């Protein structure tokens, strides 16, 4: 069976070096190109370079010249992608893929792909979240429904858990996935849609728990005095 097997996930810090590998199996390794493709989580595929191991011929996208090095070793059927000085912007998934050598007897496209190697480059250390109340406003109310929530900002690492009223309130509750800010810290929000008439009677509290940092916060969300 034709197959490309890549190396395990990598968690590095900025300024460090890295070398991930892709091993071919089930075919004659020297007689096919192997290309490397970058994909930032949630974004499109970006091609970086390609190498023919038979004679070692290597091509790079002009942007990446001097940023990475692609290599290959025939005795071990392995292609390699290496960074000398990693930077935060290098955080992404990386795929290796086999490409034909320009002949009709083979598929002249990325017909085989490795499972990918995730590379996470962050100088972030464990930090607890900050919980801010997203209070429901008079403009928010529409058809008797108001939206209110909590902002869990600047925490690391994942995950954080959020509940409302110690788990009593489930309906209308949606907790969004986390976003990675430029600071390397994570942020997310939890939202609840509730009858606007209940803002006077019912009290709403979000319970945020970040276990990695041993952080427990209970924040009350209430209407503003305007």
- Where on the chain is the footprint of another protein (CB under 8 A)? 28, 30-31, 33, 35, 37, 42, 44-47, 50, 52, 54-55, 57, 59-62, 74, 95, 97, 99, 101-104, 107-111, 113-116, 130, 132-135, 137, 140, 142, 147, 149, 151, 153-154, 171, 174, 176-177, 179-182, 187-189, 191, 193, 224-226
- The rounded distance, in Å, linking the Cα atoms of 61 and 51 is 12
Of 3, 9, 65, nearest to 34 by C-alpha is 3
CB of 164 to another protein, least distance (A): 14
Q: Which is nearer to another protein, 16 or 130 (CB)?
A: 130
Rg of the chain taking only CA atoms, in angstroms: 25
CB of 92 to another protein, least distance (A): 14
CB 161 within 8 A of CB 206: no
Q: Which is nearer to another protein, 69 or 130 (CB)?
A: 130
CB of 211 to another protein, least distance (A): 22
CB of 145 to another protein, least distance (A): 9
Token pair recorded at residue 138: 């008079």
CB of 195 to another protein, least distance (A): 15
Token pair recorded at residue 146: 């108001």
Of 56, 47, 55, 61, nearest to 97 by C-alpha is 47
DSSP E strand stretches across the chain = 3-6, 10-12, 18-25, 33-39, 45-52, 57-60, 68-73, 78-83, 92-99, 110-113, 117-121, 130-134, 145-155, 161-164, 173-175, 179-180, 186-195, 204-210, 215-221
CB of 159 to another protein, least distance (A): 15
Q: Which is nearer to another protein, 17 or 109 (CB)?
A: 109
Q: Which is nearer to another protein, 8 or 42 (CB)?
A: 42
Does residue 88 sit in helix, strand or coil? Answer: helix
CB of 117 to another protein, least distance (A): 11
Q: Which is nearer to another protein, 95 or 155 (CB)?
A: 95
Q: Which is nearer to another protein, 113 or 212 (CB)?
A: 113
Q: Which is nearer to another protein, 16 or 217 (CB)?
A: 217
- The rounded distance, in Å, linking the Cα atoms of 119 and 7 is 11
């Amino acid at each position: 069976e034709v197959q490309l097997v890549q190396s395990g996930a990598e968690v590095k810090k900025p300024g460090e070096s890295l070398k991930i590998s892709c091993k071919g199996s089930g075919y004659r390794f020297p007689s096919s190109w192997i290309g490397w493709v970058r994909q930032v989580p949630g974004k499109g595929l970006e091609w970086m370079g390609i190498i023919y191991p038979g004679d070692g011929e290597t091509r790079y996208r002009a942007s990446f010249q001097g940023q990475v090095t692609i290599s290959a070793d025939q005795s071990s059927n392995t292609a390699y992608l290496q960074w000398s000085s990693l930077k935060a912007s290098d955080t992404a998934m990386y795929y290796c893929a086999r490409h034909g050598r320009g002949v009709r007897e083979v598929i002249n496209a990325f017909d085989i792909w490795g499972q990918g190697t995730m590379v996470t480059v962050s100088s972030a250390s464990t930090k607890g979240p900050s919980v801010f109340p997203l209070a429901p406003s008079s403009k928010s109310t529409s058809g008797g429904t108001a939206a209110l929530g909590c902002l869990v900002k600047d925490y690391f690492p994942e995950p954080v858990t959020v509940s409302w009223n110690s788990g009593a309130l489930t309906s209308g509750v949606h907790t969004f996935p986390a976003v990675l800010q430029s600071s390397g810290l994570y942020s997310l929000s939890s939202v609840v849609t509730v009858p606007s008439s209940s803002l006077g009677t019912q009290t709403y509290i979000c319970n945020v728990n970040h276990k990695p940092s041993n952080t427990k916060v209970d924040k009350k969300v209430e209407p503003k005095s305007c």
